[PDB]
Amino acid sequence: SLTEIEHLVQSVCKSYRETCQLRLEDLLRQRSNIFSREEVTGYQRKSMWEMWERCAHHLTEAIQYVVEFAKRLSGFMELCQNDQIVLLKAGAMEVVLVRMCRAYNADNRTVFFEGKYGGMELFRALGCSELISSIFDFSHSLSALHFSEDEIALYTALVLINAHRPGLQEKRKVEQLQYNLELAFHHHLHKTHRQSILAKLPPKGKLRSLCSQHVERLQIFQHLHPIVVQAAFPPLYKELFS
């Protein structure tokens, strides 16, 4: 079923186009739009907890777009609800972190944040400099690959659809979706002469560890200073919030 695989590609890429938040062309064109030193100081002088509220709300929105991404993947809504939640709990923030590389400019080590590009020093008030450095470093590694939009879409589909996540109830059903996505990704890389990126993808455990550290810090902040969430997915919200 060759066209089936070429189908799944178009459908992962449609889901991705509909949920990617900002077009790559817009992110690239704005690269010259950089926060001034005056604007940087304004962010650095904000309360920890206001910077936390702003960042938490951008991240909640990013997670919701990833959930919509998964929901639009052919086969995902046919998984049982338990397995949908297991997969999204384990992988949605991993996908958010990967998606960040599109908004990262390796030339000056800046990220697109609230309308302009700024470096790590923008986030000083959060007092999380080690975690922020790890996020910038990771985006720097991914940015060297020059990910195309379909590569990010297919790669992040596989971040989510991982039959190894503990707690799955219909593991063979997740495996079938995983195998088809893997074939789609590998067929696409062969067609575009891009198989060389396979050896350059983040090693096993590196995205897991960064995401673990990230979510753990978000949980600490939410314990100290809870944000109000525009909750759209009750079964998933209930797994992350208490």
Ligand X SMILES: O=C(O)c1ccc(OCc2c(-c3c(Cl)cccc3C(F)(F)F)noc2-c2cc[nH]c2)cc1F
Contact between residue 128 and residue 217 where contact means Cβ atoms under 8 Å apart:
yes
Decide: is 9 part of the binding site for ligand X (CB under 6 A): no
Q: What is the distance between the alpha carbons of residues 146 and 218, in angstroms, rounded to a whole number?
A: 29
Residue 86 touching ligand X (CB under 6 A)? no
Q: How far apart (Å, rounded) are the C-alpha atoms in residues 183 and 57? A: 35
Query: How near is the Cβ of 223 to ligand X at its closest, in Å?
Result: 8
Identify which range of 3-11, 69-77, 127-135, 213-221 contacts ligand X by CB under 6 A.
213-221
- In the complex with ligand X, which residue's Cβ is closer, 169 or 219? 219
Range in contact with ligand X (rule: CB under 6 A) among 21-29, 40-48, 195-203, 225-233: 225-233
88/189 with CB nearer ligand X = 88
Q: Which residue number, 40 or 85, has a Cβ lying nearer to ligand X? A: 85
- Confirm or reject binding of residue 88 to ligand X (CB under 6 A): yes
Site for ligand X in 90-119 (CB under 6 A): 92-93
237 belongs to the binding site for ligand X (CB under 6 A):
yes
Under rule CB under 6 A, residue 64 binds ligand X: yes
Q: Is 162 in the site for ligand X (CB under 6 A)?
A: no
Between 17 and 56, how does the x/- string for binding to ligand X read (CB under 6 A)?
---------------------------------------x
Report, in Å, the least distance between residue 110 CB and ligand X: 22
Structure tokens at 160: 């989510």
| Binding site residues, ligand X, CB under 6 A | 56, 59-60, 63-64, 88-89, 92-93, 215, 218-219, 222, 227, 229, 231-233, 236-237, 240-241
